[PDB]
Amino acid sequence: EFQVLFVLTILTLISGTIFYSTVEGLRPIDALYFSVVTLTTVGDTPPPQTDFGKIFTILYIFIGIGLVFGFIHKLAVNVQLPSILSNLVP
Amino acid sequence: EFQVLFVLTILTLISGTIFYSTVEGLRPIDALYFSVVTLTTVGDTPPPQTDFGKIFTILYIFIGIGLVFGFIHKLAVNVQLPSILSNLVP
Amino acid sequence: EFQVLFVLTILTLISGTIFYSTVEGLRPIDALYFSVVTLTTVGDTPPPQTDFGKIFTILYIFIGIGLVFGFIHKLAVNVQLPSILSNLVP
Amino acid sequence: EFQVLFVLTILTLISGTIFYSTVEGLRPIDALYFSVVTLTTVGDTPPPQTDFGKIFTILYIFIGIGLVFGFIHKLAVNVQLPSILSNLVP
Ligand SMILES: [K+]
Ligand SMILES: [K+]
Ligand SMILES: [K+]
Ligand SMILES: [K+]
Ligand SMILES: [K+]
């Protein structure tokens, strides 16, 4: 489960990185950062400048938000929770 | 279900597109983009400049956030999930 | 239920409106807008300029996010849902 | 439960405060503010300027969002809810 959501999230972020670096002309790291803060809904960066970028982002949000949060919901409930929960047992 | 949330989301976005292009003077694509990143709570664009825009946005958020995320919750759990889940079966 | 969350949300927003208009010197409408986009996590406006504003905002987020989304979760599931659901019945 | 999520959230925010003040050169209060609005997904501030800051933020979001919202979900359902719910009983 976690591993699958892990791969699915990675692929989604790779696509975004490739897209924004190419179409919005961002350095790969900045393209990855934008992809991440967009799908996690933080949105702390300026928006895309091109219409292609705006259209892709709209679709990217609708298709990727569900996945990204599904992964986060498991990364903290099925991986981070035990490490602390079990450790909370003397 | 999915089709209904599909239509409801579309109509909500159409209203926002019409509103922001008219009142905030945005090009349709930019009006749609603002509507989308606002309802999905990304919020990566500058805020509305007019008081009418601010008031509408406040109401738009409260009335549209629930719907938009309801659609996303189905688009990934009742449409994207199987495609990958079933395919995860050798 | 809905009415209680309605009042609780209103009071929370009134406090924010009073706070930001006074401490950050915002016009009431802008103070309300900031309060709304902050608690709904849209965050499309610049951040507070004063330390008092930053501290209050941190506490305001932790105490108000839960309430605001609780209200939204009811406004769309216990009020907007039927209007369309029942109407979806020929 | 609440106390544990309380401590876990505090530690997470302390790490962010130390990180951003050091690497992004922010005053402690601003470092804390950025950490808070990032993990709660408000994202109303400009993004990190350094690559180290961008990389850390990406990891910080994925590891901290789950925890922070877990704490919020309890702070309003297991602490703020009763205070008003029980009080809603004549
Ligand atoms: K946001
Ligand atoms: K959310
Ligand atoms: K958000
Ligand atoms: K934002
Ligand atoms: K901004």
PDB file of all heavy atoms in Angstrom, chain B residues 57-80:
ATOM      1  N   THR B  57     -15.640  36.244  -3.261  1.00  0.00           N
ATOM      2  CA  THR B  57     -14.685  35.178  -2.985  1.00  0.00           C
ATOM      3  C   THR B  57     -14.924  34.515  -1.638  1.00  0.00           C
ATOM      4  O   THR B  57     -14.810  33.296  -1.518  1.00  0.00           O
ATOM      5  CB  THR B  57     -13.248  35.691  -3.058  1.00  0.00           C
ATOM      6  OG1 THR B  57     -13.021  36.246  -4.360  1.00  0.00           O
ATOM      7  CG2 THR B  57     -12.253  34.539  -2.829  1.00  0.00           C
ATOM      8  N   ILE B  58     -15.252  35.314  -0.625  1.00  0.00           N
ATOM      9  CA  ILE B  58     -15.534  34.768   0.699  1.00  0.00           C
ATOM     10  C   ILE B  58     -16.708  33.785   0.619  1.00  0.00           C
ATOM     11  O   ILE B  58     -16.633  32.667   1.134  1.00  0.00           O
ATOM     12  CB  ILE B  58     -15.856  35.904   1.693  1.00  0.00           C
ATOM     13  CG1 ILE B  58     -14.577  36.696   1.982  1.00  0.00           C
ATOM     14  CG2 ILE B  58     -16.436  35.338   2.993  1.00  0.00           C
ATOM     15  CD1 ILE B  58     -14.809  37.987   2.735  1.00  0.00           C
ATOM     16  N   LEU B  59     -17.787  34.193  -0.043  1.00  0.00           N
ATOM     17  CA  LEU B  59     -18.954  33.324  -0.172  1.00  0.00           C
ATOM     18  C   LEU B  59     -18.668  32.116  -1.073  1.00  0.00           C
ATOM     19  O   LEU B  59     -19.094  30.995  -0.792  1.00  0.00           O
ATOM     20  CB  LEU B  59     -20.136  34.125  -0.733  1.00  0.00           C
ATOM     21  CG  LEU B  59     -20.591  35.295   0.148  1.00  0.00           C
ATOM     22  CD1 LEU B  59     -21.643  36.116  -0.585  1.00  0.00           C
ATOM     23  CD2 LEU B  59     -21.140  34.766   1.460  1.00  0.00           C
ATOM     24  N   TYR B  60     -17.933  32.359  -2.154  1.00  0.00           N
ATOM     25  CA  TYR B  60     -17.566  31.327  -3.118  1.00  0.00           C
ATOM     26  C   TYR B  60     -16.769  30.220  -2.419  1.00  0.00           C
ATOM     27  O   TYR B  60     -16.990  29.036  -2.666  1.00  0.00           O
ATOM     28  CB  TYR B  60     -16.734  31.974  -4.235  1.00  0.00           C
ATOM     29  CG  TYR B  60     -16.491  31.135  -5.468  1.00  0.00           C
ATOM     30  CD1 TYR B  60     -17.551  30.616  -6.215  1.00  0.00           C
ATOM     31  CD2 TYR B  60     -15.197  30.940  -5.946  1.00  0.00           C
ATOM     32  CE1 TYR B  60     -17.323  29.930  -7.413  1.00  0.00           C
ATOM     33  CE2 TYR B  60     -14.958  30.257  -7.140  1.00  0.00           C
ATOM     34  CZ  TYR B  60     -16.022  29.757  -7.868  1.00  0.00           C
ATOM     35  OH  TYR B  60     -15.785  29.085  -9.050  1.00  0.00           O
ATOM     36  N   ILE B  61     -15.852  30.610  -1.537  1.00  0.00           N
ATOM     37  CA  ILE B  61     -15.045  29.633  -0.814  1.00  0.00           C
ATOM     38  C   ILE B  61     -15.911  28.739   0.070  1.00  0.00           C
ATOM     39  O   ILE B  61     -15.841  27.516  -0.010  1.00  0.00           O
ATOM     40  CB  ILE B  61     -13.983  30.331   0.066  1.00  0.00           C
ATOM     41  CG1 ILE B  61     -12.891  30.934  -0.823  1.00  0.00           C
ATOM     42  CG2 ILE B  61     -13.376  29.325   1.059  1.00  0.00           C
ATOM     43  CD1 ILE B  61     -11.912  31.822  -0.064  1.00  0.00           C
ATOM     44  N   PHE B  62     -16.745  29.353   0.900  1.00  0.00           N
ATOM     45  CA  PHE B  62     -17.597  28.586   1.800  1.00  0.00           C
ATOM     46  C   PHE B  62     -18.582  27.663   1.104  1.00  0.00           C
ATOM     47  O   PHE B  62     -18.857  26.567   1.584  1.00  0.00           O
ATOM     48  CB  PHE B  62     -18.342  29.533   2.741  1.00  0.00           C
ATOM     49  CG  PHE B  62     -17.535  29.939   3.938  1.00  0.00           C
ATOM     50  CD1 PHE B  62     -16.985  31.213   4.025  1.00  0.00           C
ATOM     51  CD2 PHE B  62     -17.292  29.030   4.966  1.00  0.00           C
ATOM     52  CE1 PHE B  62     -16.200  31.580   5.119  1.00  0.00           C
ATOM     53  CE2 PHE B  62     -16.506  29.390   6.066  1.00  0.00           C
ATOM     54  CZ  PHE B  62     -15.961  30.667   6.137  1.00  0.00           C
ATOM     55  N   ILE B  63     -19.108  28.099  -0.034  1.00  0.00           N
ATOM     56  CA  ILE B  63     -20.079  27.293  -0.756  1.00  0.00           C
ATOM     57  C   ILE B  63     -19.465  26.289  -1.729  1.00  0.00           C
ATOM     58  O   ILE B  63     -20.046  25.229  -1.975  1.00  0.00           O
ATOM     59  CB  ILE B  63     -21.065  28.203  -1.515  1.00  0.00           C
ATOM     60  CG1 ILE B  63     -21.811  29.083  -0.506  1.00  0.00           C
ATOM     61  CG2 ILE B  63     -22.044  27.366  -2.332  1.00  0.00           C
ATOM     62  CD1 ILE B  63     -22.774  30.060  -1.125  1.00  0.00           C
ATOM     63  N   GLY B  64     -18.289  26.608  -2.262  1.00  0.00           N
ATOM     64  CA  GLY B  64     -17.659  25.728  -3.231  1.00  0.00           C
ATOM     65  C   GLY B  64     -16.595  24.749  -2.768  1.00  0.00           C
ATOM     66  O   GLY B  64     -16.376  23.730  -3.424  1.00  0.00           O
ATOM     67  N   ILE B  65     -15.926  25.037  -1.659  1.00  0.00           N
ATOM     68  CA  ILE B  65     -14.883  24.138  -1.170  1.00  0.00           C
ATOM     69  C   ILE B  65     -15.422  22.731  -0.910  1.00  0.00           C
ATOM     70  O   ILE B  65     -14.819  21.742  -1.330  1.00  0.00           O
ATOM     71  CB  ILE B  65     -14.215  24.704   0.113  1.00  0.00           C
ATOM     72  CG1 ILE B  65     -13.099  23.769   0.600  1.00  0.00           C
ATOM     73  CG2 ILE B  65     -15.263  24.926   1.184  1.00  0.00           C
ATOM     74  CD1 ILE B  65     -13.564  22.521   1.331  1.00  0.00           C
ATOM     75  N   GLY B  66     -16.561  22.641  -0.230  1.00  0.00           N
ATOM     76  CA  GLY B  66     -17.139  21.342   0.069  1.00  0.00           C
ATOM     77  C   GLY B  66     -17.378  20.499  -1.166  1.00  0.00           C
ATOM     78  O   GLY B  66     -17.026  19.317  -1.204  1.00  0.00           O
ATOM     79  N   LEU B  67     -17.975  21.114  -2.181  1.00  0.00           N
ATOM     80  CA  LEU B  67     -18.274  20.440  -3.436  1.00  0.00           C
ATOM     81  C   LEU B  67     -17.022  19.987  -4.173  1.00  0.00           C
ATOM     82  O   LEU B  67     -16.888  18.816  -4.535  1.00  0.00           O
ATOM     83  CB  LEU B  67     -19.077  21.372  -4.345  1.00  0.00           C
ATOM     84  CG  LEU B  67     -19.222  20.928  -5.803  1.00  0.00           C
ATOM     85  CD1 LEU B  67     -19.903  19.570  -5.868  1.00  0.00           C
ATOM     86  CD2 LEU B  67     -20.018  21.965  -6.573  1.00  0.00           C
ATOM     87  N   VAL B  68     -16.110  20.925  -4.399  1.00  0.00           N
ATOM     88  CA  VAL B  68     -14.874  20.630  -5.109  1.00  0.00           C
ATOM     89  C   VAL B  68     -14.086  19.466  -4.513  1.00  0.00           C
ATOM     90  O   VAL B  68     -13.586  18.614  -5.245  1.00  0.00           O
ATOM     91  CB  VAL B  68     -13.971  21.879  -5.178  1.00  0.00           C
ATOM     92  CG1 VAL B  68     -12.605  21.512  -5.748  1.00  0.00           C
ATOM     93  CG2 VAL B  68     -14.637  22.942  -6.044  1.00  0.00           C
ATOM     94  N   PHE B  69     -13.960  19.426  -3.191  1.00  0.00           N
ATOM     95  CA  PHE B  69     -13.222  18.339  -2.564  1.00  0.00           C
ATOM     96  C   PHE B  69     -14.016  17.043  -2.550  1.00  0.00           C
ATOM     97  O   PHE B  69     -13.441  15.956  -2.473  1.00  0.00           O
ATOM     98  CB  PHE B  69     -12.784  18.743  -1.157  1.00  0.00           C
ATOM     99  CG  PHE B  69     -11.503  19.516  -1.145  1.00  0.00           C
ATOM    100  CD1 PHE B  69     -11.513  20.903  -1.199  1.00  0.00           C
ATOM    101  CD2 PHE B  69     -10.280  18.851  -1.161  1.00  0.00           C
ATOM    102  CE1 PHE B  69     -10.323  21.622  -1.276  1.00  0.00           C
ATOM    103  CE2 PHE B  69      -9.083  19.560  -1.235  1.00  0.00           C
ATOM    104  CZ  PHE B  69      -9.105  20.949  -1.293  1.00  0.00           C
ATOM    105  N   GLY B  70     -15.336  17.163  -2.640  1.00  0.00           N
ATOM    106  CA  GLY B  70     -16.173  15.981  -2.676  1.00  0.00           C
ATOM    107  C   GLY B  70     -15.913  15.297  -4.003  1.00  0.00           C
ATOM    108  O   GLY B  70     -15.810  14.072  -4.081  1.00  0.00           O
ATOM    109  N   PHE B  71     -15.793  16.107  -5.052  1.00  0.00           N
ATOM    110  CA  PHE B  71     -15.527  15.605  -6.395  1.00  0.00           C
ATOM    111  C   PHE B  71     -14.137  14.983  -6.480  1.00  0.00           C
ATOM    112  O   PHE B  71     -13.951  13.938  -7.107  1.00  0.00           O
ATOM    113  CB  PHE B  71     -15.650  16.739  -7.414  1.00  0.00           C
ATOM    114  CG  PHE B  71     -15.092  16.401  -8.765  1.00  0.00           C
ATOM    115  CD1 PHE B  71     -15.770  15.534  -9.615  1.00  0.00           C
ATOM    116  CD2 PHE B  71     -13.878  16.938  -9.182  1.00  0.00           C
ATOM    117  CE1 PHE B  71     -15.247  15.205 -10.863  1.00  0.00           C
ATOM    118  CE2 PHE B  71     -13.347  16.615 -10.428  1.00  0.00           C
ATOM    119  CZ  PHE B  71     -14.033  15.746 -11.271  1.00  0.00           C
ATOM    120  N   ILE B  72     -13.161  15.633  -5.855  1.00  0.00           N
ATOM    121  CA  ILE B  72     -11.795  15.130  -5.858  1.00  0.00           C
ATOM    122  C   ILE B  72     -11.719  13.802  -5.105  1.00  0.00           C
ATOM    123  O   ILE B  72     -11.022  12.879  -5.524  1.00  0.00           O
ATOM    124  CB  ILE B  72     -10.827  16.142  -5.200  1.00  0.00           C
ATOM    125  CG1 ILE B  72     -10.735  17.409  -6.059  1.00  0.00           C
ATOM    126  CG2 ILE B  72      -9.458  15.507  -5.014  1.00  0.00           C
ATOM    127  CD1 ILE B  72      -9.842  18.505  -5.478  1.00  0.00           C
ATOM    128  N   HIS B  73     -12.451  13.714  -3.998  1.00  0.00           N
ATOM    129  CA  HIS B  73     -12.465  12.508  -3.177  1.00  0.00           C
ATOM    130  C   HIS B  73     -13.052  11.312  -3.919  1.00  0.00           C
ATOM    131  O   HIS B  73     -12.797  10.164  -3.555  1.00  0.00           O
ATOM    132  CB  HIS B  73     -13.255  12.758  -1.888  1.00  0.00           C
ATOM    133  CG  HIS B  73     -13.310  11.574  -0.972  1.00  0.00           C
ATOM    134  ND1 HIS B  73     -12.179  10.918  -0.534  1.00  0.00           N
ATOM    135  CD2 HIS B  73     -14.360  10.932  -0.407  1.00  0.00           C
ATOM    136  CE1 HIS B  73     -12.530   9.923   0.261  1.00  0.00           C
ATOM    137  NE2 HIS B  73     -13.848   9.910   0.356  1.00  0.00           N
ATOM    138  N   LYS B  74     -13.840  11.580  -4.955  1.00  0.00           N
ATOM    139  CA  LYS B  74     -14.448  10.514  -5.743  1.00  0.00           C
ATOM    140  C   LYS B  74     -13.617  10.244  -6.994  1.00  0.00           C
ATOM    141  O   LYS B  74     -13.484   9.102  -7.431  1.00  0.00           O
ATOM    142  CB  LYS B  74     -15.876  10.894  -6.143  1.00  0.00           C
ATOM    143  CG  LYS B  74     -16.814  11.143  -4.969  1.00  0.00           C
ATOM    144  CD  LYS B  74     -16.971   9.903  -4.103  1.00  0.00           C
ATOM    145  CE  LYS B  74     -17.997  10.122  -2.999  1.00  0.00           C
ATOM    146  NZ  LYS B  74     -17.634  11.259  -2.108  1.00  0.00           N
ATOM    147  N   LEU B  75     -13.060  11.307  -7.564  1.00  0.00           N
ATOM    148  CA  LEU B  75     -12.236  11.199  -8.763  1.00  0.00           C
ATOM    149  C   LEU B  75     -10.995  10.339  -8.540  1.00  0.00           C
ATOM    150  O   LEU B  75     -10.447   9.775  -9.487  1.00  0.00           O
ATOM    151  CB  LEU B  75     -11.805  12.594  -9.228  1.00  0.00           C
ATOM    152  CG  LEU B  75     -10.748  12.657 -10.335  1.00  0.00           C
ATOM    153  CD1 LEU B  75     -11.269  11.976 -11.594  1.00  0.00           C
ATOM    154  CD2 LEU B  75     -10.394  14.109 -10.616  1.00  0.00           C
ATOM    155  N   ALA B  76     -10.556  10.239  -7.289  1.00  0.00           N
ATOM    156  CA  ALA B  76      -9.369   9.456  -6.966  1.00  0.00           C
ATOM    157  C   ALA B  76      -9.683   8.139  -6.263  1.00  0.00           C
ATOM    158  O   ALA B  76      -8.889   7.200  -6.317  1.00  0.00           O
ATOM    159  CB  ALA B  76      -8.419  10.288  -6.110  1.00  0.00           C
ATOM    160  N   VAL B  77     -10.837   8.066  -5.608  1.00  0.00           N
ATOM    161  CA  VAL B  77     -11.221   6.851  -4.893  1.00  0.00           C
ATOM    162  C   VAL B  77     -12.184   5.956  -5.673  1.00  0.00           C
ATOM    163  O   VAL B  77     -12.205   4.741  -5.471  1.00  0.00           O
ATOM    164  CB  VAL B  77     -11.860   7.189  -3.525  1.00  0.00           C
ATOM    165  CG1 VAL B  77     -12.246   5.908  -2.798  1.00  0.00           C
ATOM    166  CG2 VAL B  77     -10.884   7.996  -2.682  1.00  0.00           C
ATOM    167  N   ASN B  78     -12.970   6.547  -6.567  1.00  0.00           N
ATOM    168  CA  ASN B  78     -13.932   5.778  -7.350  1.00  0.00           C
ATOM    169  C   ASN B  78     -13.644   5.749  -8.853  1.00  0.00           C
ATOM    170  O   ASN B  78     -14.447   5.234  -9.630  1.00  0.00           O
ATOM    171  CB  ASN B  78     -15.346   6.317  -7.113  1.00  0.00           C
ATOM    172  CG  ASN B  78     -15.776   6.202  -5.663  1.00  0.00           C
ATOM    173  OD1 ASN B  78     -15.122   6.731  -4.765  1.00  0.00           O
ATOM    174  ND2 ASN B  78     -16.882   5.506  -5.429  1.00  0.00           N
ATOM    175  N   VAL B  79     -12.502   6.297  -9.259  1.00  0.00           N
ATOM    176  CA  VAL B  79     -12.122   6.322 -10.669  1.00  0.00           C
ATOM    177  C   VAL B  79     -10.633   6.038 -10.892  1.00  0.00           C
ATOM    178  O   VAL B  79     -10.270   5.195 -11.714  1.00  0.00           O
ATOM    179  CB  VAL B  79     -12.466   7.684 -11.309  1.00  0.00           C
ATOM    180  CG1 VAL B  79     -12.073   7.682 -12.776  1.00  0.00           C
ATOM    181  CG2 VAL B  79     -13.952   7.968 -11.159  1.00  0.00           C
ATOM    182  N   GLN B  80      -9.774   6.742 -10.165  1.00  0.00           N
ATOM    183  CA  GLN B  80      -8.334   6.555 -10.300  1.00  0.00           C
ATOM    184  C   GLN B  80      -7.820   5.360  -9.495  1.00  0.00           C
ATOM    185  O   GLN B  80      -6.852   4.707  -9.885  1.00  0.00           O
ATOM    186  CB  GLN B  80      -7.599   7.825  -9.860  1.00  0.00           C
ATOM    187  CG  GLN B  80      -6.099   7.786 -10.096  1.00  0.00           C
ATOM    188  CD  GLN B  80      -5.746   7.521 -11.548  1.00  0.00           C
ATOM    189  OE1 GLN B  80      -6.031   6.448 -12.083  1.00  0.00           O
ATOM    190  NE2 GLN B  80      -5.124   8.501 -12.194  1.00  0.00           N
TER     191      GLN B  80
END
